[PDB]
Structure 1
Amino acid sequence: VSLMEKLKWKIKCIENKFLNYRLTTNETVVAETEYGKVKGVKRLTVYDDSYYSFEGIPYAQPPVGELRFKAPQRPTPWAGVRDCCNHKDKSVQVDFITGKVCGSEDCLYLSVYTNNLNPETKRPVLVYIHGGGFIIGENHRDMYGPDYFIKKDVVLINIQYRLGALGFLSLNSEDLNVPGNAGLKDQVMALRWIKNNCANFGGNPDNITVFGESAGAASTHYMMLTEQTRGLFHRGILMSGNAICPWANTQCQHRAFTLAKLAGYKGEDNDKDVLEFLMKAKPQDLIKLEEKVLTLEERTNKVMFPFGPTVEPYQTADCVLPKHPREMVKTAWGNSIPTMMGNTSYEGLFFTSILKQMPLLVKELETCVNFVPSELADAERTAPETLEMGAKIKKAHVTGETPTADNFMDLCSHFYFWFPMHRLLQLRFNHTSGTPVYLYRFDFDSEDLINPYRIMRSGRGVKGVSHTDELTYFFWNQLAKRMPKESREYKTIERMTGIWTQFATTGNPYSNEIEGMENVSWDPIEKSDEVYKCLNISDELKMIDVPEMGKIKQWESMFEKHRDLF
């Protein structure tokens, strides 16, 4: 927290509103939805393109009052024309830059964008679910502008969903109807809306692609796992994340009481009494205290967030996760739709900011016991077997006699992203109709065009392709600028929106109409593959064996004596 990030961030924000106004037009339009008419408006881009914009389309009732912590309910429709010419608020969260809580409980909205409201053909529909660890994020165009994607003839939809304790509180007591995963059930309801309404915006309801980055990738994967969404969409893209990443789920049923007690609850550890208190609390109080819920023991054992997706303790009407995700892969409908997955070439660089805060973290690599997968480790991480397992990790990532910060961040690349990807691929290969999985590796490094996460990760001046660096080439954000058509950055925008649009359309990401792809033979992964091939996306596009594969096998070797748990 170095105070006046908040300044230029406030004055990049005084600019973003003038610019937003200047890029607005007077061309309003009305579209039909199953809940009533919505009025949208055309907007301009800095590349002199334009698109129709519908923001603040409700897909559920505002989950306020008695609806807090509950599964979403269908919204209440209207006669007349609803105003969708302005965005709604984001879900209640801590602003990662201003450090202050922002947003509203009234956040269950989606936005629809297209360059042509009346196309002559049904268009592929792309649905983006944002990341942010299930605790931050939004569909506001200052972070996720559609301006690049609307160069292509697609319909792009950006959803919101409840975050933090408001989205992911879970209580054991069956009588209370807070089984957990409200935020994922939000996504399910948004997907149902999209399926039933995208046609009114020129979309093909039989050709929908869901994609997401980070927590949005885990979300996309959860939407492919749950039987609640069966057949609602037809392709998935998992960008740096999936549902069996260790940060992507947690059993948090005991932490509601902790949150209550942090906020001033007086009384006993009792689900009913705890729920009653949490129902009454100011939303901004609960979200601000969320950062204090995890114990030192939990943090040591690499629990990243106190509330997130959870295995629900009993089954309700709108249950999304009845079993551990690894179990849900066994029968997942989404196993049998075309899928693309990928990661960046230095994911772990993202934890730069965390390291600067707590330098002593680097000494975790002395034994690496803390990064042994939790299901394998003992609670004190002092067991000799845990020490042995840790030594396998240590050999994969410690390059000198003493671990460095770079070693730590390389390790994080695998703990948080590459190893979970491996486990998923192998698990799914036992339960798939045979539909292809394509892998990419995003390896394009530039500091000439950036996005706000680079601030948060303090990555200005740091080199390598961190977690979230690829977002810059998919979405407009308030820190972006018009780049020369010949720049490597602009060409990367064209390649990324191009490949994603090609995959959305056909279920195959290859096209010789994409510059650089003229010699790419991009083949999906097979069960019989001992080495993964990926499209490596840099200044050149090249098919390579995943450079991370060696370290991936090294992680896998921790499961030599526990193969059932892999």
Structure 2
Amino acid sequence: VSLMEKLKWKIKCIENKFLNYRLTTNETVVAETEYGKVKGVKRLTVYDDSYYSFEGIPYAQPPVGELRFKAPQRPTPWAGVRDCCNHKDKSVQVDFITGKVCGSEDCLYLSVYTNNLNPETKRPVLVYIHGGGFIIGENHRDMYGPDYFIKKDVVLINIQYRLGALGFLSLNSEDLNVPGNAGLKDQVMALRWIKNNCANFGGNPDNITVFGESAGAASTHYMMLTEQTRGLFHRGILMSGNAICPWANTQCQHRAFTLAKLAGYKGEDNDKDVLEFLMKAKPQDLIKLEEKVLTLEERTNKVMFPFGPTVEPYQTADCVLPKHPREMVKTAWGNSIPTMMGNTSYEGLFFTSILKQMPLLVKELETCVNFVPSELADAERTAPETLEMGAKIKKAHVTGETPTADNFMDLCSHFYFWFPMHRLLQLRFNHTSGTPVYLYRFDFDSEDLINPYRIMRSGRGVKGVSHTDELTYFFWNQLAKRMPKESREYKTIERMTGIWTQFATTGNPYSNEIEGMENVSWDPIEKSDEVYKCLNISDELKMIDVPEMGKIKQWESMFEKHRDLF
């Protein structure tokens, strides 16, 4: 934590609510939701654009009291019209910036945005699911401002969903109705709301795109894997993540007890007693203590979060994940909608912050055994097979006699993003109706325009395109500024929102109408492809073989003798 970005974060807090005020108009509007009417308000962007803004729409019953750790329940209608000109609070979480908990349990809301409430054409609807490891994030416009997308004639919807233990507690006992994935169930209920309500904002319920970055990307994929959402939407975009990323799910049924004990539970390990204690604890206490739940062994084996998406121990009405994500790929309805996937060109640069607090992590590259996929590794990671597997990884990333911080982050790009994408693509090809998947590689590097993640990762002054760097060209945030029409930043905003709107609209990301894309020929990946092709998005828009391919193949060779596990 740092006292300085504590003050000037809390200076642009003042000036993002004052800027918010100024950019509001007195033009208010009312729309008919399934649950009753809602009151919006037209707002302004620094590019003198304008959109109708509906924030605070509840899609679920506030999951408080006896509803805590439970699946969302559809909320309660209302005669008259609900206020929606202000946002609700975010899910309870730790503020990376201040170190203190903020947010509320009352957080199951979404926001709807569009430049025209009655177009005389039913528009494509884009649903954004934020990332944040399933433990942080919000749909607030200070991080996810719709200002750029509303230049396009679509309807943009940003959802929230329960985070951390309040979202992802999982208990084995079938009597307790806490199977897990409450946060994903929030997503599903929100999708259902959007399918049955977008029309009333000008959107075509037959043309809906779900997209997300990081945990939002894994969320999007879960929404494409689960049988709960069959047909709800028609295109998916996976931005730097998917459901079979190692960080994207965890078997956490045994950790509820640990959380309880950290919170001062007295008694033995019994799901009923543990749940009863947890049900009554303060929400801020659980969430703050979450950072202590993982054992040293779990951390060493690269378990990144204690609570997250999980394979549910018993099926119920609202079950979202009955089997392992890999197995769900086999019958996943979403394998048969237009899909786009991509990563930035230096993902693992995101880990500068964590490397600096723990430089000993670099020594892990001496053998790389800690990065061998856990399904393949032995528990102590001392088996000679494990050493061999780790040697393949080392050969892919360690470039001198001693590993460097950069070899580490390059490795991290693959462990956390490229290799799981490869596994998904290949697993998908063996269970797909044959609908195209397009790859992008975001490779546009700038420090003129940024987003708050750069502060967390302390990538201020560091070159390369980190994980989350691309958000900047998609969403307004409080650190953003009006950029010159002819700036490389402004042009990238146009290209990104353009490509994304084009893909949403048509299920094909190519458009001759996008600046820089004239000679692009964006072909999707085929099962027969030995080398992945992607649109490299830089100052130049360029189709290239994925540079990361050789390393991807090298990781793949760890499975030479365990092909069934790949």
Aligned to 1:553: 553
Q: Deviations over 1:92-123 (max 9, x none)?
A: 00011111100000000000000000001000
Q: Which residue of 2 aligns with 1:295?
A: 295
Q: Give SS of 2:27's match.
A: strand
Give per-residue Cα distances to partners, 1:20-45, cap 9 Å, x unaligned: 00011100000001000000000000
CA deviation profile, 1:451-500 (whole Å, cap 9, x unmatched): 00000000001000000000000000000000000000000000000000
Q: Tell me what 2:19 maps to.
A: 19
Partner of 2:515: 515
Cα deviation, residue 506, structure 1: 0.2
In the aligned structure 2, how far is the partner of 1:545 from the partner of 1:91? 40
SS at match of 1:204: strand
Cα distance in 2, alignment partners of residues 177 and 280 from structure 1: 16
1:524 Cα deviation (Å)? 0.3
The answer for the alignment partner of 1:205 in structure 2 is 205
User: How far apart in 1 are the matches of 2:81 and 2:363?
Assistant: 60
Q: Secondary structure at the match of 1:330?
A: helix
Report the 3-state secondary structure (helix = DSSP H, G, I; strand = E; otherwise coil) of the residue aligned with 2:9. Answer: helix
- Give the secondary structure class of the aligned counterpart of 2:119: coil
User: What is the Cα-based RMSD across aligned positions, in Å?
Assistant: 0.4
Offset at 1:449? 0.0
How far apart, CA to CA, are the structure 1 residues paired with 2:317 and 2:562? 36
Look up the match of 1:239: 239
Q: Measure how far apart 1:258 and its partner are.
A: 0.2
Cα distance in 2 for partners of 1:353, 1:183 equals 27
* CA deviation profile, 1:231-282 (whole Å, cap 9, x unmatched): 0000000000000000000000000000000001000011000000000000
Shift of 1:377: 0.4
1:395, distance to aligned residue in structure 2 (A): 0.3
Per-residue CA deviation, residues 51-106 of structure 1 (Å, 9 max, x unaligned), is 00000000000000000000000000100010000000000000111111000000
1:488-530 CA-partner distances (Å, limit 9, x unpaired): 0000000000000000000000000000000000000000000
Report the Cα offset of residue 2 of structure 1: 2.1
Give the deviation of 1:5 after TM superposition: 1.4
After the TM superposition, list the runs of 4 or more consecutive aligned residues in structure 1 that deviate by more than 2 angstroms. Answer: none
Which structure 2 residue ranges, 5 or more long, are not aligned? none
Distance in 2 (CA, whole Å) between partners of 1:65 and 1:2 is 35
Give a deviation string over 1:367-404, Cα, whole Å, max 9, x none: 00000001000111111110100000000000000000
Is contact 2:129-2:212 (8 Å) kept? yes
Equivalent in the alignment of 1:102:
102
Residue 9 of structure 1 aligns to a residue whose secondary structure is coil
1:435-462 CA-to-partner distances (Å, cap 9, x unmatched) read: 0000000000000000000000000010
Deviations 1:136-195 (A, max 9, x none): 000000000000000000000000000000000000000000000000000000000000
Between the aligned partners of 2:38 and 2:432, the Cα distance in structure 1 is 40
Listed one character per residue, the Cα deviations across residues 298-345 of structure 1 (whole Å, up to 9, x for unaligned) are 000000000000000011110000000000000000000000000000
Distance 2:119 2:272 in 1: 53
Q: Secondary structure at the match of 1:174?
A: coil
Partner SS state of residue 247, structure 1: helix
Within 1, Cα distance between the matches of 2:546 and 2:157?
A: 31
Q: TM-score, normalised by structure 1?
A: 1.00
SS at match of 1:242: coil
Structure 1 residues not aligned, in runs of 5+:
none
Q: Report the CA distance between 1:12 and its aligned residue.
A: 1.0
Q: Which TM-score applies when normalising by structure 2?
A: 1.00
SS in 1 for 2:12: helix
Which segment is superposed worse, 3-12 or 199-208? 3-12
- Structure 2 CA distance for aligned equivalents of residues 326 and 53 of structure 1: 38
Q: Distance in 2 between matches of 1:268 and 1:186?
A: 31
Deviation at 1:4, TM superposition (A): 2.2
Secondary structure of the residue that 1:78 maps to in structure 2?
coil
- Within 1, Cα distance between the matches of 2:370 and 2:317? 38
Q: Is 2:274 the partner of 1:274?
A: yes
Is the Cα contact below 8 Å between 2:2 and 2:98 reproduced in 1? Answer: no
Residue 184 of structure 1 aligns to a residue in which SS? helix
Q: Percent identity?
A: 100
In structure 2, how many angstroms separate the alpha carbons of the residues matched to 1:175 and 1:379?
A: 33
Question: What secondary structure sits across from 2:258 in the alignment?
Answer: helix
Asked if 1 retains the 8 angstrom alpha-carbon contact of 2:516 and 2:541, the reply is: yes
Q: For residue 73 of structure 1, what is the aligned residue in structure 2?
A: 73
Equivalence for 1:379:
379
Residue 3 of structure 1 deviates from its aligned partner by 2.0
CA distance in 2, matches of 1:200, 1:356: 49
